[PDB]
């Protein structure tokens, strides 16, 4: 347990306060991270600015190396790491060093994707015939500070996704992680600093968002707000965004849709992998079930078994359902398995909880007028919802607030082509499990799931602008 | 003078009460335009909001058909609309046909490029080898209700720049033209109506700021906004748009940048050309002269002279200087004059009003301590600011508020690429006005300058999003 | 009725000394004459064309889009009077041959707008290597120069329309030089470019006898670009004598219809039938032969043998499915195929009849690899059936075939029919459908013999341009 | 000291009967031998390379450039070794030996990064015609097959990976033919790619005698895709060797350097005698004649001049600018342009030396357009100075040339710049600065008889990779 430093101008920086970091499975004492006040803050965008100037005017060549540089510091402290990781969000060990190494390999992507950015010539003649001497030279460029918010349930890849894409392009970067999971952020920094980072290209902040939550993302001195976490939260910044760029990623309500003609087997074991991975603590999950009334008494069977499979206990022993993140987590999830309980839902399997390690609960016989139909408990409890049409699965899953992914189980894909036209969501995945891999492909949702396009080639264009330059040949 | 309807789900809708609408130069009564309540902008957006599923999932080419179909018309009622948009807003009788001319050009050009609208096939293969037989099918899908707020003074162009790009793209619209620019905008309307566009896909919203005006934002049915106007009005936008995707094109304060190899008399005519159009009532027009001192007396001689061929007078004769839009903006106009005047900077031409016919106003040797130097006029005066070093130039452009677009005068066109790199600005001309043609090109400012990036097919990308279908292949 | 046709050469109507008689081979009716140009004819259009190439690639896109539009809006006002003709001189359907015309009208406007908004790209020396950081390279496309279109019999309108847009937009001159069967639907279609108010020179057409001037209009070292739609034989040889000059051939097929055990064998038998027998099998994209699971061959044979039996079998203009195929030798080779099938042993579905030229349909089930009907491009009115027992050795007897332009696969399983799709050497594979060229948006192509190049509208325009780099450092 | 080398043939080394050595063009000195293949031999490299290609293109795209990355790190450690050999063999100074490797590397690098994150598109049938609208086109890239790779003398290294990279990462399989003179550095390549562990048979390399070889290896049936730099007849005879088989061809030069009245005359002539004499202008990219108005040309050859006379002649080891040339016929051939301009009057401004092969390097002023060295790639170390009266001239005497490889602008006002690029018939314009492929991602290609096909690493990827649609109904 040591006393964790910001990296603010090339410098390891404490500050007067401090915030203790416990493990959420055992309480075990972490260590401490600074409790940045708001001048603290501004210090750290005053570096950014002005290390700006220099950084976007390096080559892609240069800014590349950087990058790949700290994803091979990643690699070698992959376990190290990944250890402390495990412990401070109480994500399975060996799932915890396997975040490491993906955010290596998108560091990695990062920097090839972005090396060859390239512009646009437009022709003047395509638009009238008095202009056809007249040519736009397109470059593209950073748009300057981006403050990037990781999540506790990725607080290094969902830290480096958004890092790693804004360097390449000549953006300067803070990183604020989450309390809960601030030493594996700052842990992902001392790579990006022993890579040689320039100062100030890259920093970090950390504190309560009692201090400095409003304040980061209002600060006049950021040019792009780039943040995962909840939608409450989420929302409140688009308020204080103004005209700003944004990225969110915000909850959802992945629905699960196994037609008649489903290969159940293949659909029970993506629902169950997806649903209850990370004990459901992920936005691009399973989260509820819209099967076909004629398949869903040996579907939900199906799904039951596999559930009573997954191990329940602590992370260090690459449990499948490990301790949420903190008891108001637990509590509300247990909120919801209690309201579908008393308005008549079959619980499959049983609930129990012991501190904040709650057993994985599976509901069939679900109805829309059961708050787990719709919420997003962020737990390990899917609901089974049964549907006599398509149409009406269709209904059902776009009546929800969220919009992020939605996974078809059919063997008629023109159909399931079909109905994914429907679907408001950003990704549908035919006979699969929701994800967001392959990190190459875009990610995104609609409605209150957030907005922007991720995945690493979108996320260089969203963290770009362009820069046009016109002269009229002779 | 007629009695004027908005175009709401293919009827055209009387209010309770009506704005009588006043030509800005003469007084003379246009007719009226409706003042909506909350609850008409209501249906307006259930019209739209049901219209969307039918207009979304026709093809590319049917959509195409009547934006085509709508150009022909305004084309062939070019002088009949132009004829009254010139006294609506007090334009030039021949620039405004030719902005109908101009609105047709767009929205044909935005047809072509929208319905080859082409999507993209991802290889897992190229992240990770275990995904090799994992492909994303990403497509092209509309936001939703785009939400067109066009300006008084291009009240048909810039509402035709957003309308078309929304529409070919599978949108639905709402457009809510300036109080002051309404009948042009519903002229505009009525071209689309007469096309045959389905009732619900494209509307009308008339009315007051005090009571649909912000309402009209933050309606929940509206899925993108995409505004046209005053800083200060868009900034109020940004706050109410939440996360939902915006374009602002806001003001400017376009620097024209005269080095001391350059050709003083192109620079000049090109300054004056871009400065005083409209009576200089336009965002991206040259709005400060930073000359390097050694040339600066000169340019100055060679600009005067063109300032005093200006005419001025009325709209329906042509005049190059015509009656600001309305007292207000003349009574702005006239406080920075006389600013300008009271700390010591040399009126070149002589400041003359009558009623809100300003006359055009050179000033020489302006300073930073001036209103003149960074506040956007929107009206006849252009001041010239003396500096000693291109570094300095490149700073005091970069210190204004504004970041739209700028010129640079000189023959070293290497020169001239470094220091575009520096200025924070959308586009950067080279030996010519600042101008935001052709349209194929991107239009983009920077700062308070607005968000998003406009011209055709750029526009037509930021108001869709993307729909990912990813399945393995077996 | 028997006009006296001419070449479109420097904007002015042109005859020869010599004359070649066109008949249509369904009636022998005389139709018309077209010139027999000399060498030294040819070499005047093309230095016509050359002369022209500075002043039209120097027009902006906007401006040759307007003249492409105009022909197009001609060839939709005349599509039933061209149509007419095209029927005669290739005995192709009297509504098939209208509905060639209006097709070309749309591929026209279609290239026009697509090429319009061709773009260039700007790329960064700090991609490559940090001390070019400054140095960029401004791209702009141009064209090739003086493109020669060389059209076929089976589509002269269509076919020689899919090559002069894509080529008149990007800035190219076009020399048309037509087969001798479809010259007159050529110079038609000239008409219409000539009365759009084409500039002089920017296109012309070339006729005569190949034995005169064959090798002579593509060896021309004035053609910088050789567009050319044929059969196979005649298109290898076009590539001898390109030398290093770019080209695009569009040769023959023998597209495979791969029909699995679980696959919808009446809509199967549907596309087969429409694909296979569609003008008389005289299409390079074509089911030419039926792959199919022997558990469902019986079914499926039936099926289609149903649908043989319910084509019509009768001249141009009475729209007749079969109609005369294009003269006597094609129809030989096609009966030749019919008796070597039947000599080895296959069963024929329906019944062999040829009266002159017009070959009725014959479908022939229990084919075998040794059958010469299992591999040569007919080009007329027969279908083999032939069965397999796996989808690896349908996929194998597929790729045997040293053509690959197209192939269809009938199954319910797409996630199947994409990982068969991987693995077959053919440029596009059609699900649940007929093998098929359209929408002219998507890409055409064919591997190994079936030809060179990516067509289809924007391809088309891609490959007819080249690229002006103009590197400079930023200081 | 001298080594037998071996050819790398479906992940073995094998010898052949009989050998060709090679010997150091600037001192004699025996380097070693290679084999001299026989037809069969290469029958073998070419059915390996078919059977290889298979479980090559199935791997995912970061399996190829795995293998391509291993072999740059491997070709890093050893550019020491690998440029010692390669300075000797073709006569080209140490340390640029050395640099020619690390290039080598670096494009390998690049190759394999640019390869593996290429998109297929999506196309809808919608934006040709409203019946289409639920038909949909998933357009994905597949290799071409097998692609040839010729080598050139004068980058032996650097132009084997040019080709070998980007044809791998798009899952071709490769064999490389280096040049006799070359083939010693090319084998040497070889070996970091199989030490890199590729596959047996997705790399392979041929050498042998052009009389025994020669048309072989390019008109073989296995081979889908040839890819060739080298002098221009040669590659004239490959363009009717390929039949309808695609083919990029890197051929000759004679860039020309327009110098303008308003020009940096002292800067003109430091990137002027850099990019003329770099390997004693044995390069295709290379100032070949300087067309400078006449106002400004007494200035500007007494500043070239000087830079003439300071050049440095010698031997490889001493990493002389100027070193000997190829050979003796390569010699003789630059001694008769030389004496012919002599001959006709122009006037040297510098001396004409030949010791062995090694020619001093001859600056040319006053030459008129009767002389060969006004037209002929001489690559070898002379330059002529052509004078020119107005700038409309200058570009006609530019295109004059039946080589259009890039051209250099030196002026102060680049929109004149830029109109004057654009009716330049060369692939790439430099403005104010010497003609050059780099960087490698840019785009290089040639006009007329300077080659065919987009050279760079990113459109090199998109000539030897094609196109496979997957065309469906939407339900």
Same mark, same amino acid.
């Given at each position: @347990?040591?006393?964790?430093?910001?990296?603010?101008?090339?410098?390891?920086?404490?500050?007067?306060?401090?915030?203790?970091?416990?493990?959420?499975?055992?309480?075990?004492?972490?260590?401490?991270?600074?409790?940045?006040?708001?001048?603290?803050?501004?210090?750290?965008? #005053?570096?950014?600015?002005?290390? /700006?100037?220099?950084?976007?005017?390096?080559?892609?060549?240069?800014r590349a190396a950087?990058?790949?540089?700290?994803?091979?510091?990643?690699?070698?402290?992959?376990?190290?790491?990944?250890?402390?990781?495990?412990?401070?969000?109480?994500?399975?060990?060996?799932?915890?060093?396997?975040?490491?190494?993906?955010? #290596?390999?998108?560091?990695?992507?990062?920097?090839?994707?972005?090396?060859? &950015?390239?512009?646009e010539v437009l022709?003047?003649?395509?638009?009238?015939?008095?202009?056809?001497?007249?040519?736009?030279?397109?470059?593209?460029?950073?748009?300057?500070?981006? =403050? @990037? *918010?990781?999540?506790?349930?990725?607080?290094?890849?969902?830290?480096?996704?958004?890092?790693?894409?804004?360097?390449?392009?000549?953006?300067?970067?803070?990183?604020?992680?989450?309390?809960?999971?601030?030493?594996?952020?700052?842990?992902?920094?001392?790579?990006?600093?022993?890579?040689?980072?320039?100062?100030?290209?890259?920093?970090?902040? $950390?504190?309560?968002?009692?201090?400095?939550?409003?304040?980061?993302?209002?600060?006049?001195?950021?040019?792009?707000?780039?943040?995962?976490?909840?939608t409450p939260i989420?929302?409140?910044?688009?308020?204080?965004?103004? &005209?700003?760029?944004?990225?969110?990623?915000?909850?959802?309500?992945?629905?699960?849709?196994?037609?008649?003609?489903?290969?159940?087997?293949?659909?029970?074991?993506?629902?169950?992998?997806?649903?209850?991975?990370?004990?459901?603590?992920?936005?691009?999950?399973?989260?509820?079930?819209?099967?076909?009334?004629?398949?869903?008494?040996?579907?939900?069977?199906?799904?039951?078994? =596999?559930?009573?499979?997954?191990?329940?206990? &602590?992370?260090?022993?690459?449990?499948? *359902? $490990?301790?949420?993140?903190?008891?108001?987590?637990?509590?509300?999830?247990?909120? /919801?398995?209690?309201? #579908?309980?008393?308005?008549?839902?079959? %619980?499959?399997?049983?609930?129990?909880?012991?501190?904040?390690?709650?057993?994985?609960?599976?509901?069939?016989?679900?109805?829309?007028? &059961?708050? =787990?139909?719709?919420?997003?408990?962020?737990?390990?409890?899917?609901?089974?919802?049964?549907?006599?049409?398509?149409?009406?699965?269709?209904?059902?899953?776009?009546?929800?607030?969220?919009?992020?992914?939605?996974?078809?189980?059919?063997?008629?894909?023109?159909?399931?082509?079909?109905?994914?036209?429907?679907?408001?969501?950003?990704?549908?995945?035919?006979?699969?499990?929701?994800?967001?891999?392959?990190?190459?492909?875009?990610?995104?949702?609609?409605?209150?799931?957030?907005?922007?396009?991720?995945?690493?080639?979108?996320?260089?264009? %969203?963290?770009?602008?362009?820069?046009?330059?016109?002269?009229?040949?002779?």
């Open positions: @347990a040591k006393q964790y430093k910001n990296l603010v101008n090339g410098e390891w920086k404490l500050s007067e306060n401090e915030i203790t970091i416990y493990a959420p499975a055992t309480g075990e004492e972490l260590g401490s991270v600074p409790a940045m006040t708001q001048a603290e803050v501004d210090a750290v965008y #005053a570096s950014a600015k002005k290390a /700006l100037s220099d950084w976007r005017t390096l080559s892609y060549v240069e950087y990058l790949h540089k700290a994803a091979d510091i990643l690699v070698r402290d992959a376990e190290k790491i990944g250890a402390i990781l495990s412990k401070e969000v109480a994500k399975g060990h060996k799932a915890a060093v396997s975040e490491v190494i993906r955010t #290596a390999e998108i560091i990695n992507y990062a920097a090839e994707e972005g090396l060859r &950015m390239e512009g022709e003047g003649g395509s638009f009238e015939a008095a202009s056809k001497k007249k040519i736009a030279i397109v470059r593209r460029e950073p748009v300057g500070l981006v =403050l @990037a *918010i990781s999540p506790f349930n990725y607080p290094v890849n969902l830290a480096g996704s958004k890092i790693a894409p804004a360097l390449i392009a000549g953006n300067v970067v803070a990183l604020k992680p989450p309390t809960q999971g601030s030493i594996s952020g700052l842990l992902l920094a001392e790579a990006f600093a022993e890579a040689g980072i320039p100062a100030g290209v890259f920093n970090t902040i $950390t504190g309560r968002g009692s201090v400095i939550g409003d304040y980061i993302v209002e600060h006049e001195a950021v040019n792009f707000i780039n943040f995962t976490g909840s989420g929302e409140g910044i688009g308020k204080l965004a103004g &005209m700003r760029p944004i990225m969110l990623e915000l909850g959802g309500k992945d629905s699960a849709i196994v037609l008649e003609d489903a290969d159940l087997a293949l659909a029970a074991k993506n629902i169950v992998a997806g649903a209850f991975g990370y004990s459901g603590q992920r936005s691009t999950a399973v989260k509820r079930v819209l099967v076909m009334d004629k398949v869903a008494d040996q579907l939900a069977a199906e799904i039951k078994t =596999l559930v009573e499979k997954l191990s329940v206990g &602590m992370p260090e022993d690459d449990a499948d *359902i $490990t301790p949420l993140i903190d008891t108001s987590a637990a509590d509300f999830v247990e909120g /919801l398995i209690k309201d #579908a309980t008393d308005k008549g839902a079959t %619980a499959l399997t049983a609930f129990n909880r012991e501190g904040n390690l709650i057993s994985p609960v599976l509901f069939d016989h679900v109805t829309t007028d &059961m708050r =787990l139909a719709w919420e997003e408990p962020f737990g390990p409890v899917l609901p089974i919802i049964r549907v006599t049409t398509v149409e009406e699965a269709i209904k059902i899953s776009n009546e929800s607030e969220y919009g992020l992914q939605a996974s078809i189980f059919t063997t008629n894909f023109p159909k399931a082509f079909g109905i994914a036209e429907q679907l408001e969501v950003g990704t549908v995945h035919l006979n699969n499990k929701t994800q967001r891999g392959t990190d190459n492909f875009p990610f995104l949702g609609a409605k209150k799931s957030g907005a922007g396009v991720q995945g690493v080639k979108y996320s260089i264009e %969203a963290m770009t602008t362009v820069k046009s330059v016109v002269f009229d040949i002779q």
